[PDB]
Amino acid sequence: RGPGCA
Amino acid sequence: IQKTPQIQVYSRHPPENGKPNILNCYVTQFHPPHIEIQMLKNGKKIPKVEMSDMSFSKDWSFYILAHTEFTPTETDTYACRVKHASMAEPKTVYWDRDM
Amino acid sequence: SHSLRYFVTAVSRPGFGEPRYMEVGYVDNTEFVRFDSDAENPRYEPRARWIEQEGPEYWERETRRAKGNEQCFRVDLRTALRYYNQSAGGSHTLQWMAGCDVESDGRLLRGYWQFAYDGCDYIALNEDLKTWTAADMAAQITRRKWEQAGAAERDRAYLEGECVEWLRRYLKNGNATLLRTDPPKAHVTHHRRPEGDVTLRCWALGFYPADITLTWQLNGEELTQEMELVETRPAGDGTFQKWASVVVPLGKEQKYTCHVEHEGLPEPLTLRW
């Protein structure tokens, strides 16, 4: 899957 | 603006007269990403020009694959005109049948 | 050596609305997912038949992750306007590439996480996965702000765990397409040049993956400084193309051989005119 934002 | 694009025009399968092939315009290494592409059959705007693979590479420079359906004849002539902010005028790359 | 990779792009357009937010996902440099904020019913879509075997909770998650990132990038672009004291009516670009390369065993080889503003390096996560290399004073504001937040620890947690574990799974469930090898069909053409000589063109067609070497030899000597090359170009059916050319005199055409080396060939291919 992909990375996220904080 | 920044990176001048790099264009290539070619068919998907080895071209023979009469048989319906696929015509590709492969524009790479340009920045900004906003870019104008147009495939021409004898200078006339071709309608349903598909688009594909709009992304960028580790260079950070964007690239896009513009294809469309076509049929070669020994007199027809095809080209791909590309307007980009890096160029003072749009560049057209004619499709040589041997390249 | 394999890789999972995500190329994210945000482009502003002051006067046309909110920025166009894009995501493209790759495994071994092959696209398999994609997101576009402009697309009719915008959502995370499959770009290969093998990823289509994922359940619906998979797609809802990435469609929501992506859309959450879109919300942040819209702010980033606003943050990068005051960082450079830039006019609000200018169209700007923010690119992001993250991913994780995995060595032959399975453990993480290299972890990536860098940004780029208007086409230049903005900031990046170092090989230690502990520290940031910032490119300018504006990116130094970001660098310190992330060090106090602990971003790299959260960022490494992804690269070393989820990024690796989902690459290990993508490879297991999509091998038949990704790990396939298509041998390049090769042939030579002949072209009389105006200056009296001849150009030979040696085509390598319809091959997967992309990496190839094309050479022309005369009596064993490789002719690198007289060769004309084209960059590898996609046929559009998933396979690729490439040709090389040399300028040889008439009569002497059958002196030169073209040596094709692909990973789908046990031996290289030799061809004459």
Side-chain angles (χ1 to χ4, degrees), chain C residues 88-102:
Chain C
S91 170
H92 290 230
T93 300
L94 187 45
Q95 299 158 271
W96 179 29
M97 190 284 284
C100 54
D101 309 57
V102 157

Side-chain angles (χ1 to χ4, degrees), chain C residues 11 13 16 18-22 35-43 70 74:
Chain C
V11 172
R13 43 191 164 191
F16 285 176
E18 298 278 55
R20 180 183 202 182
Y21 182 81
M22 272 166 287
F35 179 86
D36 193 333
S37 61
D38 284 352
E40 190 247 318
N41 186 18
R43 59 183 203 183
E70 161 171 39
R74 301 167 157 190

Side-chain angles (χ1 to χ4, degrees), chain B residues 10 12 54 60 98-99, chain C residues 34 95 201 233-235 241:
Chain B
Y10 59 97
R12 179 174 301 184
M54 177 49 149
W60 294 114
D98 292 299
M99 296 232 188
Chain C
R34 157 156 285 181
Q95 299 158 271
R201 193 151 288 145
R233 65 216 198 186
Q241 291 164 358

Side-chain angles (χ1 to χ4, degrees), chain C residues 228-241:
Chain C
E228 228 209 354
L229 230 56
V230 285
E231 297 272 337
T232 309
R233 65 216 198 186
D237 48 29
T239 72
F240 302 93
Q241 291 164 358

Side-chain angles (χ1 to χ4, degrees), chain C residues 181-185 205-208 262 264-265:
Chain C
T181 180
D182 289 355
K185 318 259 77 172
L205 302 179
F207 55 90
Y208 185 92
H262 189 253
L265 302 162

Side-chain angles (χ1 to χ4, degrees), chain C residues 79-211:
Chain C
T79 300
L81 271 193
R82 82 184 70 110
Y83 276 0
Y84 299 93
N85 325 115
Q86 287 164 337
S87 111
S91 170
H92 290 230
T93 300
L94 187 45
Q95 299 158 271
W96 179 29
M97 190 284 284
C100 54
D101 309 57
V102 157
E103 199 37 274
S104 186
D105 324 304
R107 202 137 218 91
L108 190 279
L109 183 58
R110 258 228 65 161
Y112 288 83
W113 195 296
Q114 45 241 206
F115 300 83
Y117 184 65
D118 288 338
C120 301
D121 279 356
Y122 180 93
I123 204 183
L125 180 57
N126 300 330
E127 275 203 78
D128 46 54
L129 312 180
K130 290 187 170 299
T131 41
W132 308 88
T133 296
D136 55 310
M137 271 266 151
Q140 291 275 355
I141 306 178
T142 297
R143 177 178 143 276
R144 286 182 294 275
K145 203 203 55 162
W146 287 355
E147 298 205 329
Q148 191 140 47
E153 195 170 351
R154 210 269 287 166
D155 286 0
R156 155 174 31 204
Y158 166 78
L159 299 172
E160 267 178 0
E162 194 170 347
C163 190
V164 165
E165 279 143 5
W166 280 93
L167 174 62
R168 210 185 281 119
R169 154 170 190 164
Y170 293 155
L171 297 158
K172 162 152 59 179
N173 291 130
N175 69 285
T177 334
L178 304 159
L179 315 185
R180 95 191 176 283
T181 180
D182 289 355
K185 318 259 77 172
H187 85 265
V188 187
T189 50
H190 186 291
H191 298 81
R192 318 273 277 94
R193 304 212 324 129
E195 298 76 9
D197 37 24
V198 172
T199 267
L200 299 164
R201 193 151 288 145
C202 177
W203 302 75
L205 302 179
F207 55 90
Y208 185 92
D211 227 288

Side-chain angles (χ1 to χ4, degrees), chain A, chain C residues 62 69 72 158 162 170:
Chain A
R1 312 201 303 245
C5 154
Chain C
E62 297 291 282
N69 296 337
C72 308
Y158 166 78
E162 194 170 347
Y170 293 155

